Amino acid sequence: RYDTEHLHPDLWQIFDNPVDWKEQYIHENYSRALEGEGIVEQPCPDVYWFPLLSEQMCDELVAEMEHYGQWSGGRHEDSRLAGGYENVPTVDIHMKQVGYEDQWLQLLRTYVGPMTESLFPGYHTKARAVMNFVVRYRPDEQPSLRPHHDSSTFTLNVALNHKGLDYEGGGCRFLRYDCVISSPRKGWALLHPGRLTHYHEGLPTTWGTRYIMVSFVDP
Amino acid sequence: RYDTEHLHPDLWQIFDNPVDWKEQYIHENYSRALEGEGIVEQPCPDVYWFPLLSEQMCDELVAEMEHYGQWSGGRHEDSRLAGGYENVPTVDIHMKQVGYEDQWLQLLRTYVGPMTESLFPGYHTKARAVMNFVVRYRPDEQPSLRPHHDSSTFTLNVALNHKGLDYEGGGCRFLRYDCVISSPRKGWALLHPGRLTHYHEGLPTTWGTRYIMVSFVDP
Ligand SMILES: *[C@@H]1O[C@H](CO)[C@@H](O)[C@H](O)[C@H]1NC(C)=O
Ligand SMILES: *[C@@H]1O[C@H](CO)[C@@H](O)[C@H](O)[C@H]1NC(C)=O
Ligand SMILES: O=C(O)CCC(=O)C(=O)O
Ligand SMILES: O=C(O)CCC(=O)C(=O)O
Ligand SMILES: [Fe+2]
Ligand SMILES: [Fe+2]
Numbered sequence: 001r002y003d004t005e006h007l008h009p010d011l012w013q014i015f016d017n018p019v020d021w022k023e024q025y026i027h028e029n030y031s032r033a034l035e036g037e038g039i040v041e042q043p044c045p046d047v048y049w050f051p052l053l054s055e056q057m058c059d060e061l062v063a064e065m066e067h068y069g070q071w072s073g074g075r076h077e078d079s080r081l082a083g084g085y086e087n088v089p090t091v092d093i094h095m096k097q098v099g100y101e102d103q104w105l106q107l108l109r110t111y112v113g114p115m116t117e118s119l120f121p122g123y124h125t126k127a128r129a130v131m132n133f134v135v136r137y138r139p140d141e142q143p144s145l146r147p148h149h150d151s152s153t154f155t156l157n158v159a160l161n162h163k164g165l166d167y168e169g170g171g172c173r174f175l176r177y178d179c180v181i182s183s184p185r186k187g188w189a190l191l192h193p194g195r196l197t198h199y200h201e202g203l204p205t206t207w208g209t210r211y212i213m214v215s216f217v218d219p
Numbered sequence: 220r221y222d223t224e225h226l227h228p229d230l231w232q233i234f235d236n237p238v239d240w241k242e243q244y245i246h247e248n249y250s251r252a253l254e255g256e257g258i259v260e261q262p263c264p265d266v267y268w269f270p271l272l273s274e275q276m277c278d279e280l281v282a283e284m285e286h287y288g289q290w291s292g293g294r295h296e297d298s299r300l301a302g303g304y305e306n307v308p309t310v311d312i313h314m315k316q317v318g319y320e321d322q323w324l325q326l327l328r329t330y331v332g333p334m335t336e337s338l339f340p341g342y343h344t345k346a347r348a349v350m351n352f353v354v355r356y357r358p359d360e361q362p363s364l365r366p367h368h369d370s371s372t373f374t375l376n377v378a379l380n381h382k383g384l385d386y387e388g389g390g391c392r393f394l395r396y397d398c399v400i401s402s403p404r405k406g407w408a409l410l411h412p413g414r415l416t417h418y419h420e421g422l423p424t425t426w427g428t429r430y431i432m433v434s435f436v437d438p
Contacts (some may be wrong), residue, residue: 045264046416121394122368122418147341153415175340193415196372197265199341 007067008060014103018110026111027054027187034115044179046197048119052111052189058160062211064100065093065134074142091142092133104132108217112156116191125218132215134160137169137205144202147175150194152216157190160211167210170203226286227279233322237329244276245330246406253334263398265411267338271330272406277379281430284312284353293361310361311352323351327436331375335410350435353379356388356424366394366420369413372437376409379430386429389422403431 001016003009014021029051033039041049073092077084080094095101109127117123131152137144161167163184171181172190176199181190192198220235222228233240252258252269260268292310297303299313314320328346336344350371356363380386382402390400391409395418400409411417413435 120415120418122366123415149341193412195414196339196342196412197416199339 007063011060011064011100012103014106022111025054025057027051029187030111034118036118040119043181044174044177046192047174047179048191049185049188050115050119050191051185051187052158053187055187058186061134061213062160064098065211068093068098070097071136071141088145088148090133090135090145092135094131094133101132104215105129108156108215112217116154119191127217128219129215129217130219134211134213137167137202137210137212139205139207144170144204147199147201149196149199150216151219152194153218154191155194156213156215156217157192158213159184159186159188160213161209162186163210167205167208169205169208169210173201173203175199175201226283230276230279230283230319231322233325241330244273246270246273249330253337255337259338262400263393263396265417266393266398267410268407269334269410270404270406271377271408274405277406280353280432281379284317287312287317289316290355307364307367309354309364311354313352320351323434324348327375327434331408331436335373338410344437346436347438348434348436349438351433353430353432356386356429356431358423358425363389363421363423366418368418369435370438371413371435373410374413375432375434375436376411377432378403378405378407379432380428381405382429385427386424387426388424388429392420392422394418394420 003012006012010024029039033050039050043049071091071093074089076086076089078086078089080096095104105127108129113125113127116125129152157172163169163186171184172192173180176197180203182203184190192200194200222231225231229240229243248258248270258269262268290310290312292312293308295305295308297305297308299315314323324346327348332344332346336342348371376391382388382404390403392399395416399422403409411419413419
């Protein structure tokens with residue numbers, strides 16, 4: 001079965017041919033990082049930086065999302081939320097409306113779980129996520145977020161476009177540690193707990209346009 | 220109204236006469252530690268050490284606990300748990316048996332809450348807890364625990380007697396930082412997240428008997 005009603009219908013082949021899917025899409029530095037020869041960085045305590053996605057994932061994903069185009073979100077209330085009251089709103093496209101959510105849960109189950117289990121010894125996961133979306137920061141649509149906290153055990157944060165060549169801005173800002181992340185990488189991911197210890201704030205974009213993928217796993 | 224069918228009935232006066240209850244039982248230095256002129260210590264990353272209970276409350280609580288006698292617990296399976304299986308058993312007296320549950324929840328709601336809201340800015344608590352007990356460590360019946368995690372946002376650890384004078388043992392040992400807590404004080408408290416980034420293990424006791432008090436707040 002190979003449906004062709006997509007710009008890149010190959011992206012749906014995660015179930016059918018997982019090995020070639022990983023070969024094409026997953027960043028080539030992932031396996032070496034997982035087996036433990038460095039690569040991963042700890043810019044701040046209890047924060048880790050390991051590369052996950054290759055450029056093809058990034059460009060094809062932004063292509064698909066821009067093909068959808070419908071940039072909902074921004075209002076403090078919500079209908080996608082059962083409670084109907086977002087703590088902070090963002091202009092977002094959730095994976096539920098695109099139909100890609102199941103593949104994303106499969107990706108989180110297979111290629112992120114082991115990384116966290118090896119990074120935090122003694123922690124056991126099943127990689128359950130309910131809220132997952134891609135956020136766009138534009139200097140005119142929406143500024144960066146206010147300081148807040150995340151309703152999940154830890155949050156997976158992945159960039160989607162190259163800083164400088166397309167946009168200029170900043171990354172995260174950890175208040176309690178005076179930590180600033182200033183140069184996000186295109187193919188890397190950020191892992192940090194977001195319930196109690198880490199009060200984080202978003203740095204403001206100045207020129208260009210940036211895309212960020214965020215997921216809440218283990219709520 | 221006054222119930223005199225207790226060894227120390229004044230312990231149950233946290234609802235009628237809050238001010239005198241606080242003046243007699245709560246450690247005197249609590250207010251100073253709350254308003255922020257030191258005292259509160261951070262021996263290891265994201266762990267805190269501030270005084271909560273004075274000597275009178277500790278001694279009376281210990282005596283009232285030992286009066287009950289039935290130091291149950293020890294089997295891997297459980298009857299006090301809805302699921303019916305402990306991950307790790309320890310000799311404990313759940314407060315629900317002795318009736319002190321409501322007053323303990325009141326104490327957590329009144330005194331701990333503001334203190335933990337001050338320590339971690341941007342966090343809002345309701346001090347709702349389900350698991351709360353007192354564990355007796357003894358070199359004869361049960362030594363210390365295997366390394367593990369906790370099923371709560373953060374845990375409160377309070378000692379109930381003096382080190383060296385009545386027991387010789389050890390505190391906690393944090394695996395991911397190589398942190399050792401050498402000398403617990405009598406009435407002080409220990410706060411630390413207990414789900415993701417604190418893989419802690421308790422040291423074993425060799426001489427005499429020691430008491431600690433735990434509460435898994437914010438399930
Ligand atoms: C993968 O890591 C190696 C380490 O030497 C590096 O040479 C290579 O450029 C990396 N691949 C990338 C960044 O796509
Ligand atoms: C409370 O702190 C003061 C600090 O000046 C100290 O003098 C006093 O002994 C403390 N109370 C105790 C340890 O019970
Ligand atoms: O959109 C969100 O609320 C999560 C993203 C966030 O706060 C962050 O990127 O740190
Ligand atoms: O037995 C337990 O789980 C409570 C005791 C504990 O975790 C500790 O001693 O730190
Ligand atoms: Fe966040
Ligand atoms: Fe514990």
